[PDB]
Amino acid sequence: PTALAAAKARMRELAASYGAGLPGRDTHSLMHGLDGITLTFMPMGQRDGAYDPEHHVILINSQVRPERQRFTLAHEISHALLLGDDDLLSDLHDEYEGDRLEQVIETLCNVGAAALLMPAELIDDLLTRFGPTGRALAELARRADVSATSALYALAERTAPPVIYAVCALSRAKELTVRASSASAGVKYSLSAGTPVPDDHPAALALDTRLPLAQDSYVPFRSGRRMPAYVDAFPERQRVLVSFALP
Ligand SMILES: [Cl-]
Ligand SMILES: [Zn+2]
Ligand SMILES: [Zn+2]
């Protein structure tokens, strides 16, 4: 493991610790875990949040939607722990400099955000009950209380057997488009955003019929090739969360 992989590993260990000692990862319990810090909600123009370690206070744009609010929180807690760990903080300072480290730390805040909001356990608990499916994703996203995109990467990172996740939305069965996408450990096939969803494809039917599905099908590679694999489409508020277990 290289520095960026060692740092991320560390940051996960950290989120893991802080979080571990929480009665859940709900926004309110994330707050209680704050070892005496002023958490203030207020309008921050076009800025989701900030963390002020001199005045020991996290600020979270109140304007924004609960989704990003909860995340911007998880994100700024993570930032606080990084500054807490003098090693991860130090090792970092001797490997990156200037904006280069700045980018690295806002990256490690996101790695940690996810570790906080989406416990390894939960992913596996769901990956066990529901397997690697478009519903394992629908459940983790609704259950950790984060976005399909936020839960798209977390779930694909615990999935062993080659699989390809993707969260979908309409163009306007009806015709939909790939928005986010995630490859399991094994997979090297890539399903990028903008890729469209044929009307005959299970997933379309799924979101159209506002009804879950699951059947052998194919990965509708934007390019043109229809690669077969077991799809599980889970529709909901106009998003079709879907899995593509490449055989
Ligand atoms: Cl930030
Ligand atoms: Zn920050
Ligand atoms: Zn940040």
Swiss-Prot record:
Changing Y153A: Decrease in radiotolerance. Transmembrane segments: none annotated. It holds the Pfam family Peptidase_M78. Keywords: Hydrolase, Metal-binding, Metalloprotease, Protease, Stress response, Zinc. InterPro entries: G3DSA:1.10.10.1030, IrrE_HExxH, Rad_response_metalloprotease. One of its GO terms (molecular function) is metallopeptidase activity. Composed of three structural domains: an N-terminal zinc-peptidase domain, a central helix-turn-helix motif, and a C-terminal GAF-type domain. This is Radiation response metalloprotease IrrE. It comes from Deinococcus deserti (strain DSM 17065 / CIP 109153 / LMG 22923 / VCD115).
